[PDB]
Assembly symmetry: D2
Homo-oligomer: 424 residues x 4
């Protein structure tokens, strides 16, 4: 069966999960040798534990390894990897793009590798200091964006494998047309048929199976706002097609949007994913409850995911008490993975704009204020004021000393200004 | 033929007082047979040259991403600093976190310079397409970039200089450390190379700029204020600082008397082979900065200087508020025309995300809404990234799509976006 | 109102007969506020334009590495072909071996074009420093490169076009396949997009060249000879070929009647929006090539055409030796002015190393010495890489070192090399 | 106390005779808190360890691409060599052509090792999915890879070792040259580092493997046969070879008496800290190879040695045909159990494409059809790449598509391909 093919999968991991392929297909397609993907195994099993043990798992979108390291240091238990942020400031074309699948398909997995490598160094630093870790683990699970798979089922298969090699714990795929892909909160989205998205989800599961990892799959539907559909071939989509409207010049069908096609698609996708996610136009607890209840009528207890999107104007949509309870209330509905997709972008850009403005106005006064804020945050667990230790200078000092039997004349920390000027 | 005919964009006087070990005919022999233009490198170098002569001083912050650089320019800063320390920490081509020891691959700095220029390019495209003029003097603020110790010998310095020119950097700095033992200026264990050996690296950088045909600026850095080791006493200019009583180390290094005296001697020896001179210092000391400038200007009147306002200093520990507030202005009057906070982008990024993540853990969406409200508040001072879809170019690419389709595209993004509906 | 003023290096008449969906004011609006030069793209596009109008025909081989391209130029070929199939096989930015289905990341083709131009650049630097003139007309032979199906929609085609221009490509080809189901021209299971949709891709590529300011050539390819599937019948130009009795597939694809007739129709529709037209074919057939050329020229007299001399054909199975020998010459006379063997680099690389490895297993150094002697024997025909230290620039970087050091370096490489000692004539 | 528990896949006796500067507690302190497996590195190192103790000798060729490595394995070679010279020439992460002087970025060699393993993985997937067993003993032939002079100091050697292990290399070689003046072994101007300094690099590499938990092989290389310069005389083991009367060069280098004697002394000093020892030589000379082996074996009986069968030698100028034919066999009996032609991939690629391009210029499709017919004729000896669609995995991805769709995909590629139609047996 499939548990034999995925040895690290915990008991019950695939309860309720259907597959288009067989276990014999997996053995036929996985090659003749066992290659381990340790960070993917550990991350997927830790993510599986967390979303079932916590009241909910909340995360922020990280655009760099350092951002992810501070998220874990502050006590967050998972990391979100946003394709929007990859497009904006962290992709393999070295360009700034809007969120339209314009960057090359390897960019997401390359960012996941960067994040895991930073977490790996943070763990090496603390392990070498010999006083225990300052966190439960540095290897918080990464839930990562595979957009619409960058093409067809074989493209979804490849990006899933790439994320697994990079050490991602879960990967999400959405029912948009890859050639017209959009941020969930932009106009002009085009859906693919329900069956076509199920093929991408099955492609992602086959990839995890042939890699031997229990990687989580998140199915996302964009049907709340999308008014276009590539094809009406699937009888499940036809009730929503406005036939009197005719097709667009591109050949797209026009559909009725809203929660109703999201519920239908979510229920159809449920056997083929581990969590379900519906993009929404507004942060709306009542709408979130309606979606959860409808999904759970067909699929009791199904795990759900919710994008707490910065594309919403929060204090305009909601009062303060609702903002404060929002994630707790979603958690009780069954949204066990909640994430702020663009948080890293907004933090990075705001923080540097304000520092640069203060620097232009007051020069070193502005920077000393940041440094003093850093000092004040050390009581709350912040450590990066001592930047030489933070990036591993002490760790590599210890590597050098082990190589040289203690005798190297060129170690870094002893006579550093960090040691001299940042003493506790 | 002289060097001005080989570098067509060089302004009058660009090379006054500059000496070269090679000839103009060497440059013709070594540059290939076809003219290749490096437009951004030309523009940046000439803008940097004008700025450092006309401004009281040019101050910059170290940027670790294109978005950080974009906000620096938007806030009104006139130049961008590219720190090799930050490349090592969070932005290199080995996708690892490193201490500042030249551990990452030699292409990483130039790759980051290219990312920065690409983000600025898109920022300029967005505003140009909107048709209301630029909100900045120029988006292409000159980049002064870190080439460390050249990543080997003179040929390696030659190659990294060319790579930075291709990436569009305006100025590049090289230091007199041993590449195999390179350190951050404020770490211990630095090893100097002979004065003559660093002059070879600087000549290699100048030959690279000459054969690329660009008036790229060269900054010569000396680490002799703190370095206590030297690879070889072969150069008679270094022998007066060698502690021959101490004998050599187990690795064969000579021990040297460090401090401002060997910095002054090396700076005066380097001066004809660079455009700015930089001495790393252990403390932010205006009296020491004045003594260095006065000594250099005795031998080379009017020589432009650079100064590292390093986060490796504990600023309030060394200086009172009045001295911090006047620090850069007083340095500028001494001749320090380029001043930069090397690790500013690292500290801003890590502090900001630690504090957001900590608040998010404790209070979930209340913490994010506080950030969003701060962003809205900053718009009166020029911040724009709250509208993140515009910021990354969604409106620009909407305009591209409309030009392609003669106006008939059914799938543009901004019109029905939540940004348009919720961020007025 | 003039595009020539937006493209300073375009020669007189470059855009005769070329239509654009966008205006010159659109270009000015979308190109940013500063002029960035793309010198190798300018030089290559203009050299390619001259070549295809002055030579009887320009033939090329698919190069999968800079070294392959260098030897092509050294041997006297005037252009270089960059194959996406070979990128997928052995030279892509996912570091994987892929079949030809647009599975690799969209930057891989431009990155290979940059590698090729960098190798040619070093070859030119070596000979320029030696001071005895070049051994070729130019090292910077124009590169015609594969943008497959644009890797998505028109904006993706726009982006890969810009990337190829930055990398210094001279011409770029785009095909009317669905990128999510893209195939090699000679595989089954190809899915066409509507005629109008491919015209949008071609216009996006022209807009990219325009905003970059370069007269880069655009090649339009149709896969309609063999493709039996089509995403949508929305375009009335495609409806005459839709098999409505067969119905749609489970994916919703329309089934179409493939062959020469839809190729001719699509080619004539694409012609105002490209510089060369190319139809993939199932066999190397001179008669079919003439029929396609004649039909296109009935609508667009003198239109430049391109032809894939594909290794996916079994050549001696299809043709006798006399027809093989005259094949490219006859095509050139019909108007096929750019002809290319797509997978030549793959077959040369894999055949050559299989045979060397087999001989090495059998006979060890005897097999390698046979290669080295063959290299020596080819020097009379212009081969130089036997002296591999010179070939990769060791002498050039010696000259760099000597200019840096005033002539007095203890660590120059060539003087005491075994190359200088053992490879003298 | 024990290193075998830290390296779980290490076979019994793997570290016999091996000394370490560091302790087992150092490894535990420096390796992080989680077990990460490096499966290809384990399998390759253990297979290479087996091969060099069971074969008469293991011979290899330098591969510059995954496709080259795939054909080496298909032809029956049992290991793959990865040359930094070839990385510099045509396969590095700066996308430039370089002479062999450590000019490219330090990640380039490991990136090529990853490419090679990925191609081999696809080859194995193809044959596994076809269900008829493999056509080779294994597709995962061990890779022995070039780490040059470590790209800096001991910490740089530590990092490049880890990168090769992540990429799945089986063994890695490090040489006693100054990284800032690094040369190909057969160029002039080499500069040695002190004996103690190279031992520190070797120890850094072993610490890297220890913390990664892999039994990766380490090859120590000495360049003292031709190097006439030395950075420092601080090590008393080097002082007997320093020409003190000559003084230091202008750069501060000591001048040394080169030849076999400093190679023997350095090799004997390096032996506890590596698994194989390699001395670069100026000529392919069996007598010098025997003198070196006999002297190393007087101090370290049974020590395994490596030998570069370099294309930088003019083989027929140095040696008669009989000596060429027995060369590797004779070296094997002396203890040279890993033998490799460093630049074989460069010479095969460049010679093959020059001769193809020359014939194409002269005779167009006749030249290519000759290659294709040669390919057909090589199929009886096991060549398969004439069917290029199968070779790169098109049939494998067809099977993936059919598994995803339960047999229903309309867009599979092989059934109606020209390969199936025109390349039938
Ligand atoms: C752009 C979306 C996120 C996504 O991944 O679609 C948003 O606005 O949060
Ligand atoms: C590490 C230095 C900067 C540098 O580039 O050396 C510092 O502490 O500012
Ligand atoms: C795979 C084709 C080439 C192409 O680019 O489609 C062939 O067989 O030549
Ligand atoms: C350049 C050498 C090989 C090496 O790796 O040094 C040769 O000529 O074989
Ligand atoms: Mg996304
Ligand atoms: Mg630095
Ligand atoms: Mg192709
Ligand atoms: Mg080498």
């Amino acid at each position: 069966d499939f548990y034999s093919l995925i040895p690290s999968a915990p008991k019950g991991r695939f309860d309720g999960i259907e597959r288009a392929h067989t276990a014999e297909d997996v053995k036929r397609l996985r090659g003749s040798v066992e290659i381990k993907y340790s960070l993917a195994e550990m991350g997927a099993n830790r993510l599986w534990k967390l979303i079932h043990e916590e009241d909910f798992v909340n995360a922020l979108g990280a655009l760099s390894g350092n951002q992810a390291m501070q998220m874990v240091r502050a006590g967050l238990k998972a990391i979100y990897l946003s394709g929007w942020q990859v497009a904006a400031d962290a992709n393999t074309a070295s360009a700034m793009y809007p969120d339209q699948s314009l960057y090359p398909a390897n960019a997401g997995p390359e960012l996941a590798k960067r994040i895991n490598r930073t977490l790996q160094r943070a763990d090496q630093i603390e392990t070498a200091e010999g006083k225990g870790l300052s966190v439960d683990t540095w290897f918080a699970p990464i839930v990562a964006d595979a957009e619409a798979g960058f093409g067809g089922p074989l493209d979804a298969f490849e990006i899933m494998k790439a994320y697994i090699e990079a050490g991602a714990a879960g990967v999400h795929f959405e029912d948009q047309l890859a050639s017209e892909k959009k941020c969930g909160h932009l106009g002009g989205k085009v859906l693919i048929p329900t069956a076509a998205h199920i093929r991408n989800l099955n492609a992602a599961r086959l990839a995890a199976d042939v890699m031997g990892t229990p990687t989580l799959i998140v199915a996302r539907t964009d049907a709340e706002a999308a008014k276009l559909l590539t094809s009406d071939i699937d009888e499940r989509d036809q009730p929503f097609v406005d036939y009197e409207a005719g097709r667009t010049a591109e050949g797209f069908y026009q559909v009725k949007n809203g929660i109703e096609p999201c519920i239908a698609r979510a229920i159809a996708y449920a056997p083929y994913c581990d969590l379900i996610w519906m993009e929404t136009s507004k942060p709306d607890l009542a709408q979130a409850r309606r979606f959860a209840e409808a999904v759970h009528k067909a699929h009791p207890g199904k795990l759900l995911a919710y994008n707490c999107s910065p594309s919403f104007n929060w204090k305009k949509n909601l009062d303060d008490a609702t903002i404060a309870k929002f994630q707790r209330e979603l958690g009780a509905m069954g949204y066990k993975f909640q994430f702020i997709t663009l948080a890293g972008f907004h933090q990075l850009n705001y923080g540097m704009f304000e520092l640069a403005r203060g620097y232009k106005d007051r020069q070193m006064a502005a920077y000393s204020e940041l440094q003093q804020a850093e000092f004040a945050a050390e009581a709350d667990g912040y450590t990066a004021t001592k930047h030489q230790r933070e990036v591993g200078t002490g760790y590599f000092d210890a590597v050098s000393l082990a190589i040289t039997g203690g005798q190297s004349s060129t170690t870094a920390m002893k006579e550093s200004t960090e040691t001299a000027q940042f003493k506790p």
